[PDB]
CSV table of C-alpha atoms in Angstrom, one decimal:
chain,number,residue,atom,x,y,z
A,51,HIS,CA,0.1,0.1,-0.1
A,52,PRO,CA,1.3,3.5,-0.8
A,53,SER,CA,1.4,4.8,2.8
A,54,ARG,CA,5.1,5.8,3.4
A,55,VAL,CA,6.2,9.1,1.8
A,56,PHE,CA,9.5,10.7,3.0
A,57,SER,CA,10.3,14.4,3.1
A,58,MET,CA,13.7,16.0,2.5
A,59,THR,CA,14.6,19.6,3.0
A,60,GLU,CA,16.3,21.1,0.1
A,61,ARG,CA,17.4,24.6,-1.2
A,62,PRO,CA,15.1,25.5,-4.2
A,63,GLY,CA,16.8,28.9,-4.9
A,64,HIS,CA,17.8,32.3,-3.4
A,65,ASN,CA,16.2,35.5,-2.8
A,66,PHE,CA,17.6,38.0,-5.5
A,67,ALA,CA,15.6,41.0,-4.6
A,68,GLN,CA,17.6,44.3,-4.0
A,69,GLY,CA,19.3,44.5,-0.8
A,70,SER,CA,19.1,47.4,1.6
A,71,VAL,CA,21.3,50.3,0.4
A,72,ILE,CA,23.4,52.1,2.9
A,73,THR,CA,24.6,55.5,1.9
A,74,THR,CA,28.2,56.0,3.5
A,75,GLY,CA,29.6,58.9,1.4
A,76,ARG,CA,32.7,56.8,0.6
A,77,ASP,CA,34.1,57.0,-2.9
A,78,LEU,CA,35.0,53.2,-3.2
A,79,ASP,CA,31.6,52.0,-2.2
A,80,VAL,CA,29.5,50.7,-5.1
A,81,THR,CA,26.0,49.1,-5.1
A,82,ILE,CA,24.3,47.5,-8.2
A,83,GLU,CA,21.2,49.4,-9.2
A,84,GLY,CA,18.4,46.8,-9.6
A,85,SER,CA,19.6,43.4,-11.0
A,86,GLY,CA,23.2,42.7,-11.9
A,87,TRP,CA,26.3,41.2,-10.6
A,88,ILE,CA,30.1,42.1,-10.1
A,89,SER,CA,32.4,39.5,-11.6
A,90,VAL,CA,35.4,38.7,-9.3
A,91,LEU,CA,37.9,35.8,-9.0
A,92,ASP,CA,38.4,34.0,-5.7
A,93,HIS,CA,41.5,32.7,-3.9
A,94,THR,CA,41.8,29.7,-6.2
A,95,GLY,CA,41.3,31.8,-9.3
A,96,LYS,CA,37.9,30.5,-10.5
A,97,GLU,CA,35.7,33.6,-11.5
A,98,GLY,CA,32.3,34.1,-10.0
A,99,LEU,CA,29.6,36.7,-9.3
A,100,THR,CA,29.3,38.8,-6.2
B,2,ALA,CA,-1.9,-53.5,9.0
B,3,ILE,CA,-1.2,-52.6,12.6
B,4,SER,CA,1.9,-50.4,11.9
B,5,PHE,CA,3.4,-47.3,13.5
B,6,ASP,CA,2.7,-45.3,10.3
B,7,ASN,CA,-1.1,-46.0,10.6
B,8,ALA,CA,-1.2,-45.9,14.4
B,9,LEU,CA,0.4,-42.5,14.7
B,10,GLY,CA,-1.4,-41.0,11.7
B,11,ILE,CA,0.1,-37.7,10.4
B,12,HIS,CA,0.7,-36.5,14.0
B,13,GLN,CA,4.2,-37.8,13.8
B,14,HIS,CA,5.1,-35.3,10.9
B,15,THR,CA,3.2,-32.3,12.1
B,16,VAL,CA,5.3,-31.8,15.3
B,17,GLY,CA,8.4,-31.5,13.1
B,18,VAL,CA,6.7,-28.9,10.7
B,19,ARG,CA,5.8,-26.9,13.7
B,20,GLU,CA,9.3,-26.8,14.9
B,21,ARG,CA,10.6,-25.7,11.5
B,22,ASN,CA,7.9,-23.1,11.3
B,23,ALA,CA,9.0,-21.8,14.7
B,24,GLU,CA,12.6,-21.5,13.5
B,25,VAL,CA,11.7,-19.5,10.5
B,26,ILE,CA,9.7,-17.1,12.5
B,27,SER,CA,12.4,-16.8,15.0
B,28,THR,CA,14.8,-16.0,12.1
B,29,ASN,CA,12.5,-13.3,10.7
B,30,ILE,CA,12.1,-11.5,14.1
B,31,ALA,CA,16.0,-11.6,14.5
B,32,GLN,CA,16.6,-10.4,11.0
B,33,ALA,CA,14.1,-7.6,11.2
B,34,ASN,CA,16.7,-4.9,11.6
B,35,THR,CA,19.2,-6.2,9.2
B,36,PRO,CA,18.7,-4.5,5.8
B,37,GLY,CA,18.5,-6.6,2.5
B,38,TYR,CA,16.9,-9.4,4.4
B,39,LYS,CA,13.7,-10.8,2.7
B,40,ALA,CA,11.2,-12.4,5.1
B,41,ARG,CA,10.8,-16.2,4.6
B,42,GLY,CA,7.6,-18.0,5.0
B,43,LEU,CA,7.1,-21.8,5.1
B,44,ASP,CA,4.4,-23.5,3.2
B,45,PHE,CA,2.5,-26.0,5.4
B,46,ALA,CA,1.0,-28.1,2.5
B,47,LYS,CA,4.6,-28.7,1.2
B,48,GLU,CA,5.8,-30.3,4.3
B,49,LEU,CA,2.6,-32.2,4.3
B,50,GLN,CA,3.4,-33.4,0.8
B,51,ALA,CA,7.1,-34.1,2.0
B,52,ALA,CA,5.6,-36.2,4.8
B,53,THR,CA,3.2,-38.2,2.6
B,77,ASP,CA,8.8,-24.8,0.7
B,78,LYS,CA,10.8,-21.9,2.4
B,79,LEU,CA,9.0,-19.2,0.3
B,80,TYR,CA,9.2,-15.3,0.5
B,81,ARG,CA,6.6,-13.1,2.1
B,82,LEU,CA,5.3,-10.3,-0.1
B,83,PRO,CA,5.1,-7.0,2.0
B,84,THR,CA,1.9,-5.1,2.7
B,85,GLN,CA,3.9,-1.9,3.1
B,86,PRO,CA,6.9,-0.5,1.1
B,87,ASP,CA,10.3,-0.7,2.6
B,88,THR,CA,12.1,2.6,3.9
B,89,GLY,CA,15.4,2.0,2.2
B,90,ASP,CA,16.4,-1.1,4.0
B,91,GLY,CA,14.7,-3.5,1.8
B,92,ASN,CA,13.8,-5.6,4.8
B,93,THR,CA,10.2,-7.1,4.4
B,94,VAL,CA,9.6,-8.3,8.0
B,95,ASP,CA,6.6,-7.1,9.7
B,96,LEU,CA,7.0,-7.6,13.4
B,97,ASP,CA,3.3,-7.4,14.1
B,98,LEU,CA,2.7,-10.3,11.9
B,99,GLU,CA,5.6,-12.5,13.1
B,100,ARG,CA,4.5,-12.2,16.7
B,101,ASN,CA,1.0,-13.4,15.8
B,102,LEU,CA,2.3,-16.2,13.6
B,103,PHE,CA,4.8,-17.3,16.4
B,104,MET,CA,1.9,-17.4,19.0
B,105,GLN,CA,-0.3,-19.4,16.6
B,106,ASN,CA,2.4,-22.1,15.8
B,107,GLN,CA,3.3,-22.4,19.6
B,108,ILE,CA,-0.4,-23.0,20.4
B,109,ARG,CA,-0.7,-25.6,17.6
B,110,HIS,CA,2.5,-27.2,18.3
B,111,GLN,CA,1.4,-28.1,21.9
B,112,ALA,CA,-1.9,-29.5,20.5
B,113,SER,CA,0.2,-31.8,18.1
B,114,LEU,CA,2.3,-33.1,21.0
B,115,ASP,CA,-1.1,-33.8,22.9
B,116,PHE,CA,-2.5,-35.7,19.9
B,117,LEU,CA,0.7,-37.6,19.1
B,118,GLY,CA,1.4,-38.2,22.9
B,119,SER,CA,-2.1,-39.8,23.5
B,120,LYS,CA,-1.4,-42.1,20.4
B,121,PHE,CA,1.1,-44.0,22.4
B,122,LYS,CA,-0.9,-43.7,25.7
B,123,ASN,CA,-3.8,-45.4,23.9
B,124,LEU,CA,-1.5,-47.8,22.3
B,125,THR,CA,0.1,-49.0,25.5
B,126,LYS,CA,-3.2,-49.4,27.2
B,127,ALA,CA,-4.3,-51.8,24.4
B,128,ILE,CA,-1.4,-53.8,24.7
B,129,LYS,CA,-1.0,-54.0,28.4
B,130,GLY,CA,-4.8,-54.2,28.9
B,131,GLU,CA,-4.4,-51.9,32.1
């Protein structure tokens, strides 16, 4: 009989809504207006979005 | 006539089958937790034919990844029934000799 059904928790995605913008007056502080990413390479060297 | 085969009937074989059945049920209960073990059932009519086998039990519920098809609720009931019937077979076969001895000795 089909009586036993398991459930597993999984990550379906991420929340890509715009984060809270903090005005700091610093020249080297940048925030992406709307959607978009900054391409950076980590310690190993593989590129990725941040 | 007048031979032990006819005097004892089939009660001489039933006691053995009830012992084999009890062994299989004991195996099923012990192997209930070991994954991959398939519950074994004994067909009574087969040992009846052998007197005059070791099958598999199809589960009523799915496994949980173990593959073990032993239902401990079923095994306890089947072990209780076999033990009760085993004692009756001893009573039946035991009285066969008690009547047989009384006929010979006349007392």
